[PDB]
């Protein structure tokens, strides 16, 4: 599921386009996972061993990220493509 099905589900999702005119295109290209990480009240990342999550009533979960390519077309023969990585 993790290595194939999440990525292939994201690929199978259609691109998103919006009209106000400013035309838009949203694309999801690659998926990224870190190890199970934990943020305290201060928002500081740290590795989370499963005993800590079992003890502290947390959830033994990892963050998920996808690179998002937003290509905006202002109908002036231009396609401003901006990629936001590890979102």
């Amino acid at each position: 599921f993790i290595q194939m099905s999440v990525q292939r589900i994201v690929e199978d999702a259609p691109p998103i386009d919006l009209q106000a005119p400013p035309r838009y295109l949203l694309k999801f290209e690659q998926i990224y996972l870190s190890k199970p990480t934990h943020w305290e009240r201060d928002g500081a990342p740290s590795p989370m061993m499963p005993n800590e999550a079992r003890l502290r009533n947390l959830t033994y979960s990892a963050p998920l990220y996808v690179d998002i390519t937003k290509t905006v077309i202002k109908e002036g023969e231009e396609q401003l493509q901006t990629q936001h990585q590890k979102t």
Partner: peptide
Amino acid sequence: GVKLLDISELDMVGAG
């Protein structure tokens, strides 16, 4: 396939 990231590549955006 889904890529793996090390904990050092996780920017501190979750706190901001």
